[PDB]
């Protein structure tokens, strides 16, 4: 789940830019892969549970990440977009 941790880090970065937040990524807890497109390119929705530190304290968050790739996930995606980020 290395490829997953990179998507989880991206989700935390995008959240921090969106909400002017300062969450510090720790680890992926659980991850669901879902194919949502298979015409012209692969489109995958990731449902991530990740641990991040808010004000120094480790809390759990659920992130939804939308990726497009030429090859089956989790190969290098040419598009990434945070759809949802909330504390569990």
């Amino acid at each position: 789940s290395l490829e997953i941790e990179e998507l989880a880090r991206f989700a935390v970065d995008e959240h921090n830019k969106k909400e002017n937040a300062l969450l510090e990524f720790v680890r992926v807890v659980k991850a669901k892969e879902q194919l949502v497109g298979w015409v012209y390119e692969f489109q995958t929705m990731y449902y991530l549970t990740l641990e991040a530190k808010d004000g120094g304290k480790k809390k759990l968050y659920e992130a939804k990440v939308w990726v497009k790739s030429d090859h089956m996930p989790p190969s290098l995606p040419n598009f990434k977009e945070l759809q949802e980020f909330k504390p569990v």
Binding site: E33, Q34, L35, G37, W38, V39, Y40, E41, F42, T44, D70, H71, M72, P73
Partner: protein
Amino acid sequence: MRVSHEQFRAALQLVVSPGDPREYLANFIKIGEGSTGIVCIATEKHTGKQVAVKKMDLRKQQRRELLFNEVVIMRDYHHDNVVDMYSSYLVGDELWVVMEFLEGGALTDIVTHTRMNEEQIATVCLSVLRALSYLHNQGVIHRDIKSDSILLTSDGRIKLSDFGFCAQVSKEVPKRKSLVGTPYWMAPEVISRLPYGTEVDIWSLGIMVIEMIDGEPPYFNEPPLQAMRRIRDSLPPRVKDLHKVSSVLRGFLDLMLVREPSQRATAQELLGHPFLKLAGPPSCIVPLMRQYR
């Protein structure tokens, strides 16, 4: 190059019939809907016959460029086991494709609600392979062979339909690279994004033979991603109960579900396979159909 909706509409106008078929079609009724658009039945003014009209909005496609393929490629190709495309039109922001209305429903309804015998499976395979041999010889790849793409006439004849994903290869462009099809029926080389030819239709046909034997394609209980990883990585899929299938049908299936595309049987080769000696007349199909079950 970036083109406007209106530029695209002008380009598509060059390959369709001019005007609006509402001059000769009335009493439109919506019967189906896809990601592509809707399917209607309409009454032809002179004969009073029912025809099908596929309507696809130019503004609501994942890849609008794909609207060219069926109307350009299938314009001049005709076969008794291929659904007749009569004409295409632009009506406002919609591409309309006027086609034969087959009143026997789709093969999907049969494989989900009955157990086909080997005569009936041979009958379907003979008709589909006649269509594919004809199309493959012209360099046409269907690219979405599955039970849903096979329509029955009221008298139990079998036609290949749903050419929305079709492609044409030539000497100068012998291979396609596009990711198209339906996950569970996709050839390993499609999932792997390798250049491919007509062979992908023979893999998909193999999966449809498993539909006719088992009622579902392999791994149909699993999410598409999990299924496509198995197709890509695993040995060819097998039927649920090898002892319930004849040696000749297992041999037939074994020639289609071959990972190495160059070692896969061609449509022409499969037409000569002894399994197709079990093929019966259209009357052997009629008893499977929803009306007579």
